[PDB]
Structure formats: structure tokens, C-alpha cells
Amino acid sequence: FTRWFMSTNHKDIGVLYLFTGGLVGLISVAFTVYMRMELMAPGVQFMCAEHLESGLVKGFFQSLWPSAVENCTPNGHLWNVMITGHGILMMFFVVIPALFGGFGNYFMPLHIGAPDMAFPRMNNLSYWLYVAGTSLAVASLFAPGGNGQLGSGIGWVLYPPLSTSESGYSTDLAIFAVHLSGASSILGAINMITTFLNMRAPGMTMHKVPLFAWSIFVTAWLILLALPVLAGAITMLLTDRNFGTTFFQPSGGGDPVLYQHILWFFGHPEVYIIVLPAFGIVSHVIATFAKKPIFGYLPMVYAMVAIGVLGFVVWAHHMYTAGLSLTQQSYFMMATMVIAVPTGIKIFSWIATMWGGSIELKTPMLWALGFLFLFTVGGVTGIVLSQASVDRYYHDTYYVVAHFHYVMSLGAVFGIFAGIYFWIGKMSGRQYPEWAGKLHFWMMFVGANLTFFPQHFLGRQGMPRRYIDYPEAFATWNFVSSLGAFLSFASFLFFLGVIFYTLTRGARVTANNYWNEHADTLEWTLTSPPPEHTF
Amino acid sequence: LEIIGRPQPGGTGFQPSASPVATQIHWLDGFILVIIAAITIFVTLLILYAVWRFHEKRNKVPARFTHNSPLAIAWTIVPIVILVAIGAFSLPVLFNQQEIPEADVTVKVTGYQWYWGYEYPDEEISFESYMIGSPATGGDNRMSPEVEQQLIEAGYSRDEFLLATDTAMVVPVNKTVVVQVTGADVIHSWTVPAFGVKQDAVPGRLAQLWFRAEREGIFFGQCSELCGISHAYMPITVKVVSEEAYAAWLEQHHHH
Numbered sequence: 074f075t076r077w078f079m080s081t082n083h084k085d086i087g088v089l090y091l092f093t094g095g096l097v098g099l100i101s102v103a104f105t106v107y108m109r110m111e112l113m114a115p116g117v118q119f120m121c122a123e124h125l126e127s128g129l130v131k132g133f134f135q136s137l138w139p140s141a142v143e144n145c146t147p148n149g150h151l152w153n154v155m156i157t158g159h160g161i162l163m164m165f166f167v168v169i170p171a172l173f174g175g176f177g178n179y180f181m182p183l184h185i186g187a188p189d190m191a192f193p194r195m196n197n198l199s200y201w202l203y204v205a206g207t208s209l210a211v212a213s214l215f216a217p218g219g220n221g222q223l224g225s226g227i228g229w230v231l232y233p234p235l236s237t238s239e240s241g242y243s244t245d246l247a248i249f250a251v252h253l254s255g256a257s258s259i260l261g262a263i264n265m266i267t268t269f270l271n272m273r274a275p276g277m278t279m280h281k282v283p284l285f286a287w288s289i290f291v292t293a294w295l296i297l298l299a300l301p302v303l304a305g306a307i308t309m310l311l312t313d314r315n316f317g318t319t320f321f322q323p324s325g326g327g328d329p330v331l332y333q334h335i336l337w338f339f340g341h342p343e344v345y346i347i348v349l350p351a352f353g354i355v356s357h358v359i360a361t362f363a364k365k366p367i368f369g370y371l372p373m374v375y376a377m378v379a380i381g382v383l384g385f386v387v388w389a390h391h392m393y394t395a396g397l398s399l400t401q402q403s404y405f406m407m408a409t410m411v412i413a414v415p416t417g418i419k420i421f422s423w424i425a426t427m428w429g430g431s432i433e434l435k436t437p438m439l440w441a442l443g444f445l446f447l448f449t450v451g452g453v454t455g456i457v458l459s460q461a462s463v464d465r466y467y468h469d470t471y472y473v474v475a476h477f478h479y480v481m482s483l484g485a486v487f488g489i490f491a492g493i494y495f496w497i498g499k500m501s502g503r504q505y506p507e508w509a510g511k512l513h514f515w516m517m518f519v520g521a522n523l524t525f526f527p528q529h530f531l532g533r534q535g536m537p538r539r540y541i542d543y544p545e546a547f548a549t550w551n552f553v554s555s556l557g558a559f560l561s562f563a564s565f566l567f568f569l570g571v572i573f574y575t576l577t578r579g580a581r582v583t584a585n586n587y588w589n590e591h592a593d594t595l596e597w598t599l600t601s602p603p604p605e606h607t608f
Numbered sequence: 609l610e611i612i613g614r615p616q617p618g619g620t621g622f623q624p625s626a627s628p629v630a631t632q633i634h635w636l637d638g639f640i641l642v643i644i645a646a647i648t649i650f651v652t653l654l655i656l657y658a659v660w661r662f663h664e665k666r667n668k669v670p671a672r673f674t675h676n677s678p679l680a681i682a683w684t685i686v687p688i689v690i691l692v693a694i695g696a697f698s699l700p701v702l703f704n705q706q707e708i709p710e711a712d713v714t715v716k717v718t719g720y721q722w723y724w725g726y727e728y729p730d731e732e733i734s735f736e737s738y739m740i741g742s743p744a745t746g747g748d749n750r751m752s753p754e755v756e757q758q759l760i761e762a763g764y765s766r767d768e769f770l771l772a773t774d775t776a777m778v779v780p781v782n783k784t785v786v787v788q789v790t791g792a793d794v795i796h797s798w799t800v801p802a803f804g805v806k807q808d809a810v811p812g813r814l815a816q817l818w819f820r821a822e823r824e825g826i827f828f829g830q831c832s833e834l835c836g837i838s839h840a841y842m843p844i845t846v847k848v849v850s851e852e853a854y855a856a857w858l859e860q861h862h863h864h
């Protein structure tokens with residue numbers, strides 16, 4: 074019934090975040106399938122302007138079948154709308170709502186022994202702002218936008234003057250969507266911090282709180298500083314578009330580069346807001362299936378604090394080519410390199426936890442091991458990009474695209490899958506079939522690597538970001554990348570089958586702790602699922 | 609002229625270098641590449657060995673250690689040493705890139721939707737450069753028999769489509785070229801991978817880059833900041849020629 078959506082219990086809200094983030098994730102991933110259909114071969118075959126002259130639903134189905142080049146007038150605006158929609162949905166309405174709003178709302182109170190969050194009614198409102206923001210983002214795709222078409226083709230970061238001069242009001246809907254998303258994240262952050270400090274169980278000191286609840290705690294602080302800054306930046310876009318201000322228009326004395334400073338001041342913290350809850354899940358998962366407590370619990374907590382603090386003083390590594398002086402280029406390059414030290418402490422500690430254990434290679438452990446390997450690959454290419462002298466070549470190329478998909482789609486997303494297989498039995502009372510979770514992992518591992526590793530080659534060859542079409546020489550590795558994306562998509566549909574099977578007819582969970590004794594946190598001392606009233 | 613600055617089929621490395629700055633980029637990248645490949649191989653071998661050596665069915669009783677300060681301090685100082693080594697070789701390269709020398713040739717480049725405007729202030733020469741196949745040349749940003757013939761007539765082939773422009777920026781070989789970049793409407797980005805240069809074309813600001821081409825040939829770039837519907841359709845062609853052929857090109861533009 075509709076009692077799912079009006080609940081204020083932190084367990085039901087976390088489930089609503091998880092399911093909603095999953096469906097929005099399916100929509101955004103479907104966008105990437107269409108994107109990789111067009112990038113599979115040089116020349117434009119799918120995004121033809123001729124499809125505009127047909128019906129909204131008729132032209133959609135025509136868009137999915139290839140036309141010959143001589144019958145396909147390239148429509149770059151649709152490409153720009155697709156990649157903008159794909160990026161906006163992922164960064165604001167998928168991974169953070171799933172890790173923070175989902176697993177954070179469900180398990181952080183359980184991990185600290187709290188019965189609920191400090192403000193359950195506020196926690197229910199945060200979910201509805203997320204759903205409201207998601208609706209406005211989707212509606213912008215069908216609203217009058219740039220070039221007399223629908224949708225905003227301005228990139229997920231909304232650089233002006235392009236974003237401030239895009240015709241229509243689709244861009245205004247996109248800004249309102251990001252406003253609602255940030256409000257949802259801020260309300261959630263307020264609830265994590267107040268519950269973490271005021272509602273811990275007697276005897277649970279801060280040096281006894283498990284690492285996942287710490288990761289949610291640090292993430293909630295980053296949200297409170299980063300997302301008001303972004304709200305100002307995107308509000309200055311709204312007033313330049315609608316209220317005659319000239320914050321970013323040079324004719325009225327403005328500076329477009331000023332926006333990039335304000336947006337990237339949020340833009341990099343947002344990136345550590347994504348991955349920190351995934352760090353905490355990896356700690357719990359690896360300690361469970363290595364049958365050994367986590368190595369260096371206190372350095373693990375500090376390293377996340379060090380990562381969260383440094384993530385606020387490195388933002389200009391997104392602006393090496395935007396006209397920054399040699400001195401600022403030098404500082405931000407050196408400040409960015411420092412982040413590798415606390416991150417490496419966590420990576421080596423995770424291997425130290427495995428060292429000398431009794432490792433079971435069940436599905437949640439597979440995701441965590443893939444995380445270690447694949448997040449390291451993405452993290453070291455970020456260090457490459459931190460060198461402004463080398464970023465001169467790589468900036469706005471697919472090498473950057475390869476970098477951030479290895480840390481997000483092959484890292485943070487691997488933490489999401491790790492948490493789902495680790496906790497679906499606890500959340501639902503039903504267990505997933507082990508053979509299918511393993512086949513999902515290997516399909517995703519092979520497909521996602523085939524998708525994104527060749528983009529290193531394309532970037533080194535100079536393929537720019539946000540291109541509907543590319544010179545013929547880029548054809549080979551674009552073809553491989555598209556094949557990997559199709560295999561990856563098959564693995565995600567298979568995963569949805571696995572989730573549907575698990576929830577409807579999966580093996581009934583009977584034990585409070587169906588894993589082993591080294592899952593030593595409070596949720597494993599409760600039933601599966603936990604009762605409707607905790608503590 | 610030899611077509612040098614361009615992607616090649618199945619390529620996995622950098623585009624060919626034609627400037628000392630690009631050469632520094634290739635070397636610094638290869639230096640950083642061998643160490644980050646060593647770090648990842650080191651991490652991967654550790655994970656695969658630990659899974660093999662400490663699998664449940666081979667080590668049934670897990671250890672319980674949580675501390676090891678000498679190891680923990682070793683894996684903290686060694687990355688710091690590695691990063692300092694990178695910055696030691698990287699900061700001089702970046703200083704060489706951003707410190708603008710005295711110009712032998714000066715070009716002022718302006719980004720438009722969707723084309724580039726070139727101006728030589730010392731020569732009072734100015735022209736616009738459109739993709740062969742753009743509406744300006746009669747096309748609609750796609751390959752066609754008319755576009756292929758235009759590519760051949762301009763000295764290119766069908767393979768250079770999306771890179772070749774109707775006009776080119778011509779410079780003399782082995783001369784210091786300083787380029788001043790700005791945008792006229794939205795932000796664009798001017799780049800030539802073979803030169804190791806890239807500078808955003810921001811409206812209201814005039815930024816500078818420099819290159820010295822070490823050999824003659826044709827070198828391509830593509831607009832590298834999303835600027836609207838034809839972002840993928842406003843490339844850059846730079847022709848590096850002899851000092852004599854450069855003057856010949858200059859004289860062909862002089863009005864009597």
C-alpha cells in the first residue's frame with residue numbers, strides 16, 4: 074500500500090532510497106546504452122534530426138534503429154542532452170541517494186544502537202525532495218531547451234555562458250532539480266550528524282563506532298559545507314538567466330571562470346561524498362569474509378577524516394586549462410597529490426586485513442576485491458591528471474572519462490553491489506542465490522573493464538569529451554568500449570532478475586547472523602529483518 | 609605536407625610529438641606511467657597472493673593481529689617519497705609550459721559558435737576557419753560525396769574528415785609561436801595535441817600559450833570545451849611550413 078511512502082522509520086526510508094536509486098540508475102544506464110550505440114561506429118546513425126519531424130513517441134522508436142549517413146542529419150543537441158541527463162542523474166539522483174540515503178539511513182542507526190534518527194519526519198521529507206528533484210530533472214528532458222529543441226545540452230556542471238544562454242526553460246528545471254537534490258542531502262546530513270552525536274547506545278563511544286557509521290558521519294559534514302556553496306552558484310545561474318544579473322557575463326563585468334571556482338568548490342567534495350560510504354562498506358565486508366577484524370581501525374577513521382578535509386582545498390585541478398596562474402596551478406597540483414597518502418593507507422590496510430585470514434570468496438567479498446583493484450586503477454590515473462603539465466593534454470579527453478568511471482562505476486558502484494549482496498538477507502529476510510551473484514560479478518567485471526579501459530587509449534589519442542561523432546581513427550577502441558557497455562547492461566538486467574528472484578522466492582533467512590562471527594556489528598545481533606522497533 | 613598531428617587507427621599512445629613541450633609531456637607521462645603501473649601491479653599481486661595463500665581451505669584458523677606500526681609507517685613514507693619524486697620532475701615541466709617566452713610569431717585566436725577566427729596582428733591578416741563539411745562549406749556536419757571532394761581539393765582525404773578546416777593557421781617551423789586565445793560567445797578550448805598545448809577560450813579573458821614546432825607538417829586539434837550543438841564540428845588545422853613558404857603565405861594575403 075501507500076504506507077511504504079509515508080513512513081518515517083529509518084529502515085523504510087533507506088529501502089525507498091535504495092529502490093528509487095536503483096530505478097533511476099536503470100534509466101541513466103539505459104542512456105549510456107544509447108550513447109554507446111552512437112559511439113560504436115564513426116558517422117552519426119541514430120541521433121538524426123529527421124526523427125524530430127515525427128511523433129514524440131514515434132521518433133523515439135525510430136531513434137533506436139540505425140540509418141545510413143546519407144539519411145541521418147547529425148543532431149548534436151540530442152547527444153548533449155543525453156550525456157547531460159546521464160551525468161546529472163548519476164551525480165545527484167543515483168549513487169549518493171543509494172549509499173547515503175539508502176544504506177546510510179538503514180544501517181548507521183543500527184551500527185550505533187539508535188532506535189531511529191533524531192528527526193524522523195525530516196528524514197521522510199528528505200526522500201520526497203529527492204523524488205521531486207528527480208522528477209524535475211526528468212521533466213527538463215522534455216521541456217523546451219536549447220536550439221529550439223527539448224532538453225538542456227550543457228553538461229552536468231552547467232558552465233556559463235553556455236548554461237546562461239541556453240534557450241527555453243529546461244535549464245531552469247535542471248537547476249531547480251539540483252536545488253531539491255541538495256536540500257534532500259542537507260536534511261539527511263543534519264539527521265546523520267545529530268543522531269551520531271546524541272543517540273549512541275550506552276557504552277558506544279566514538280572509538281567503538283564501526284567504520285561504516287564513521288564514513289556516513291564524515292560524509293554528512295562534507296555535505297553541509299559543499300551543497301550550500303553549490304546552491305549559491307546555481308542560483309547565480311538562475312538570476313543571470315531570468316533576473317538580469319551579470320555574475321558570469323563579461324559584457325556586464327562578469328567572469329565565467331568565477332562560476333567554475335564556486336561549482337568546483339562543491340564539485341570535488343561531491344566526489345568524496347560519493348566514495349566515503351563505499352569505503353565503510355568495504356571495511357565491513359572485507360573484515361567479515363576474511364574472518365579477521367579490520368586492520369588499523371583508528372588510522373582508517375582518520376584517513377577518512379583526512380580525505381574529507383583535503384577534498385575541500387584541491388578544487389582547481391578541474392581548471393588547469395581555464396586560465397589559472399602558474400602559482401595556483403602549482404599549489405592545487407601539490408595539494409591534490411597529498412590525498413593519495415590517506416587513501417593508500419586505507420587500501421594497504423584492507424590488504425593487511427586479508428593477510429593472515431580465512432578468506433571466503435562469496436559474492437560480497439568478490440565486489441570488495443574488485444573494488445580494491447579497480448579503485449586503485451582509477452585513483453592512480455587521477456594522480457596522473459593531478460599533474461597540470463600532463464593534464465594539459467588529457468583535459469576534456471576520454472582519459473578523464475576513463476579515470477572517473479573506474480573510481481565511480483567500477484569503484485563506488487562496486488561498493489553498492491557489495492552492500493546489497495551483504496545485506497539483502499538482513500533487510501528482506503530472503504537470501505540471494507550464490508551462483509547468480511557470482512555470475513553477476515564476473516559479467517560486470519569483464520564488461521565494465523571492456524567499456525572503460527579502452528577509453529584510456531582514446532584519451533591518449535586525443536578524443537575529446539562530449540562529442541556525438543569522432544574522426545575515423547578512433548573507431549576501433551570506441552567499438553570495443555561499446556561492446557563492453559552492452560555486456561555491462563546485460564549484467565545489470567541480470568542483476569535485476571536476481572533481486573526480483575531473491576525478494577519473491579529466495580531462500581528464507583533464519584539466522585540473525587547468516588554470515589559468520591566476524592560480522593560483529595549490532596545489526597547481526599537482530600533478526601532478519603530487524604523488528605519494526607529497534608533498541 | 610605530411611599529416612603528422614592526428615589520431616591513428618587503433619592507436620593506444622600519444623599523438624606524435626612535434627614540439628619540445630609535447631616531448632616533455634611524453635617523457636613525464638611515461639615516467640609517471642611506469643611507477644603507477646608498478647603500484648597497481650604491486651597491489652594486484654598482493655591481493656591475488658593473499659587470496660591464494662590465506663583462502664579458507666588452506667588457512668582455516670585466521671590470525672587476529674590489528675597493529676604493525678613499522679609496516680604502517682613504511683606504507684606511509686614510501687608513497688610520500690614517490691609523490692615527491694613525481695613533483696620533482698613535474699613542476700619544472702609545468703613551469704616550462706606556462707612561462708610564455710618572447711614571440712617570433714603572434715596569433716590571436718577567437719572561438720565562435722561554431723568556428724575559429726584567426727588574426728595575425730603583426731601582419732594585419734585575419735580569417736575564419738570552418739570544418740570542411742560544416743554549413744559554411746555547404747554541408748551539414750556529415751560525410752558526403754561533396755564533402756569528400758572538398759577534402760581532396762583542400763589537400764586532404766576522406767580520413768581527415770572532422771579534423772580538416774577550409775583554412776589553416778600557418779606558422780614557420782622552428783619559431784616561437786605565441787597564441788592569444790579568447791571566446792566570443794561561450795567558452796571554447798583551443799588545442800593541438802601534437803604541440804602539447806590547450807587553452808580555454810573564455811569570453812572576456814585573453815589567455816596565452818606557446819609552442820615551437822620542430823618539424824613541418826599538418827597538425828589537427830578539436831574544440832575541447834562543450835560549446836553547444838556543433839561542439840564536435842569546429843576543429844583546428846595548423847600547417848607548419850618553412851620560413852620561405854610562410855612568407856609566401858603572408859604575401860598572398862597582402863593587399864596592394
Ligand code: HEA
Nearest residue numbers: 344390413416417449452453455456458459468477480687
Ligand atoms: C568517485 C568519484 C571520484 C573519486 C574518488 C576521484 C578521485 C581522485 N580524482 Fe577524480 N574525477 C571524478 C571523480 C572522482 N575522482 C569525476 C567525476 C571527474 C570529472 C568531472 C567532470 O569534469 O565531469 C574527475 C576528474 C578528476 C580531475 C580533473 C581532470 C580534468 O578534468 O582534466 C582530477 C585532477 O587532478 C582528478 C584526480 C583525482 C585524484 C588525485 C583522486 C584521488 O582521490 C585518488 C587517490 C587514490 C589512489 C591514488 C589509489 C590508491 C592509492 C594507493 C594505492 C597509494 C599509492 C599511490 C600513489 C603513490 C600515487 N579527478
Ligand code: HEA
Nearest residue numbers: 095098105160163171228229481482538539540558561565
Ligand atoms: C556514478 C556515476 C556514473 C556511472 C555509474 C556511470 C556509468 C556509465 N557511464 Fe558515465 N558519466 C558520468 C558518471 C557515471 N557514469 C558523468 C558524471 C559523466 C559526465 C557527463 C558530462 O560530460 O557532463 C559521464 C559521462 C559518460 C561518458 C562520456 C560522454 C561524453 O563525453 O560524451 C560515457 C561514454 O561512453 C559514459 C558511459 C557510461 C556507461 C556505459 C556506464 C555504465 O553503463 C557502466 C555499467 C555500469 C552498470 C551497468 C551498473 C551501474 C550501477 C548503478 C548506477 C548503481 C545503481 C544501482 C543500485 C542502487 C542497485 N558516461
Ligand SMILES: CCCCCCCCCCO[C@@H]1O[C@H](CO)[C@@H](O[C@H]2O[C@H](CO)[C@@H](O)[C@H](O)[C@H]2O)[C@H](O)[C@H]1O
Nearest residue numbers: 106110111113114115116118139140141142559562563
Ligand atoms: C543487451 C542489449 C544491448 C543493446 C545493444 C544494441 C546494439 C545495436 C547495434 C547497432 O547495429 C549496428 O549499428 C551500426 C551503426 O553504428 C552499423 O554499422 C554500420 O552501419 C552504418 C550505417 O548505418 C555505417 O555508417 C557504419 O560505418 C557501419 O559500421 C551496423 O550495420 C549495425 O549492425
Ligand SMILES: CCCCCCCCCCO[C@@H]1O[C@H](CO)[C@@H](O[C@H]2O[C@H](CO)[C@@H](O)[C@H](O)[C@H]2O)[C@H](O)[C@H]1O
Nearest residue numbers: 084085088091092095096493497500501502572602605
Ligand atoms: C535495486 C534495489 C536493491 C534492493 C535493496 C534490498 C531490498 C530491500 C529489502 C526489501 O524490503 C523489505 O521487505 C520485507 C518483506 O518481508 C519487509 O519485511 C516486512 O514484512 C511485513 C510486511 O510484509 C512487515 O509487517 C514486517 O514489519 C516486515 O518484517 C521489510 O520491512 C522490508 O524492509
Ligand SMILES: CCCCCCCCCCO[C@@H]1O[C@H](CO)[C@@H](O[C@H]2O[C@H](CO)[C@@H](O)[C@H](O)[C@H]2O)[C@H](O)[C@H]1O
Nearest residue numbers: 506507508509512516560562563564565566567568570
Ligand atoms: C539479460 C542478460 C541475462 C543473461 C542471463 C545469463 C543466464 C545464465 C544462467 C545459467 O543457468 C544456470 O546456471 C547455473 C550453473 O551453476 C545453474 O545453477 C546450478 O549450479 C549452482 C551452483 O553450482 C547450484 O547451487 C544450483 O542449485 C544449480 O541450479 C542453474 O541451475 C542454471 O539455471
Ligand SMILES: CCCCCCCCCCO[C@@H]1O[C@H](CO)[C@@H](O[C@H]2O[C@H](CO)[C@@H](O)[C@H](O)[C@H]2O)[C@H](O)[C@H]1O
Nearest residue numbers: 505506507508509566567568569570571572574575580
Ligand atoms: C534477465 C533476467 C535474468 C533472471 C535471472 C534469475 C536469477 C535468479 C535464478 C536463481 O536460480 C535458482 O538457483 C537455485 C540455487 O540457489 C536453484 O535451487 C536448486 O538448488 C538448491 C540448493 O541445492 C536446491 O535445494 C533446490 O531444490 C534446487 O532447485 C534453483 O533451481 C534455481 O532456479
Ligand SMILES: CCCCCCCCCCO[C@@H]1O[C@H](CO)[C@@H](O[C@H]2O[C@H](CO)[C@@H](O)[C@H](O)[C@H]2O)[C@H](O)[C@H]1O
Nearest residue numbers: 509566567568569570571572573574575576577578579
Ligand atoms: C515488479 C516491477 C517490475 C520488476 C522488474 C523485474 C523483472 C525481472 C523478472 C525476472 O524473474 C526471473 O526470470 C527468470 C526467467 O525469465 C527466472 O530464471 C529462470 O531462468 C534462468 C535462466 O535460465 C535460470 O537460471 C533459473 O533457474 C530459472 O528460474 C527466474 O526464476 C525469475 O525470478
Ligand SMILES: OC[C@H]1O[C@H](O[C@H]2[C@H](O)[C@@H](O)[C@@H](O)O[C@@H]2CO)[C@H](O)[C@@H](O)[C@@H]1O
Nearest residue numbers: 403696698699700701702703704705707
Ligand atoms: O624548467 C626549469 C625552471 O627552473 C626555474 O623554475 C623553478 C622556480 O624558479 C622555483 O621557484 C621552483 O620552486 O620551481 C621551479 C622548479 O624548476 C625557472 O624559474 C624556470 O624559468 C625554469 O623553467
Ligand SMILES: CCCCCCCCCCCCC
Nearest residue numbers: 100103104107132133136151
Ligand atoms: C524507455 C525509457 C528509458 C529510455 C532509454 C534510453 C533511450 C533513449 C532514446 C532517446 C530517443 C530520442 C528522443
Ligand SMILES: CCCCCCCCCCCCC
Nearest residue numbers: 106107110136137138139140
Ligand atoms: C543491415 C540493416 C541493419 C541491421 C542492424 C540493425 C541493428 C538494430 C539494433 C537495435 C538495437 C536496439 C536496442
Ligand SMILES: CCCCCCCCCCCCC
Nearest residue numbers: 301302305306308309312335
Ligand atoms: C541574489 C542572486 C543569487 C545570490 C546567490 C549568492 C551570491 C553570493 C555569492 C556566494 C557564492 C556561494 C558561496
Ligand SMILES: CCCCCCCCCCCCC
Nearest residue numbers: 302331333334335336338398
Ligand atoms: C566559496 C568558495 C568560492 C571560491 C572562491 C572564489 C575564488 C576566486 C579566485 C579568483 C582568483 C583571481 C586571480
Ligand SMILES: CCCCCCCCCCCCC
Nearest residue numbers: 434439442443444446655659
Ligand atoms: C580482483 C578480484 C579477483 C577475485 C579472485 C576470485 C577467484 C575465485 C576462484 C574461484 C572460487 C570458487 C568459486
Ligand SMILES: CCCCCCCCCCCCC
Nearest residue numbers: 507508509511512515516519
Ligand atoms: C559452484 C560453482 C561456482 C559458481 C561460479 C559462477 C560464476 C562462473 C563464472 C562465470 C564467468 C562469466 C564471464
Ligand SMILES: CCCCCCCCCCCCC
Nearest residue numbers: 113114556558559560561563
Ligand atoms: C559492423 C556491424 C557491427 C555490429 C555489431 C553489433 C554488436 C552487438 C552485440 C551485442 C552484445 C551484447 C552482449
Ligand SMILES: CCCCCCCCCCCCC
Nearest residue numbers: 450454529620621644645648
Ligand atoms: C595503471 C594503468 C593506467 C591506464 C593507462 C593505460 C595506458 C596504456 C599505455 C599504452 C601506450 C602504448 C604506446
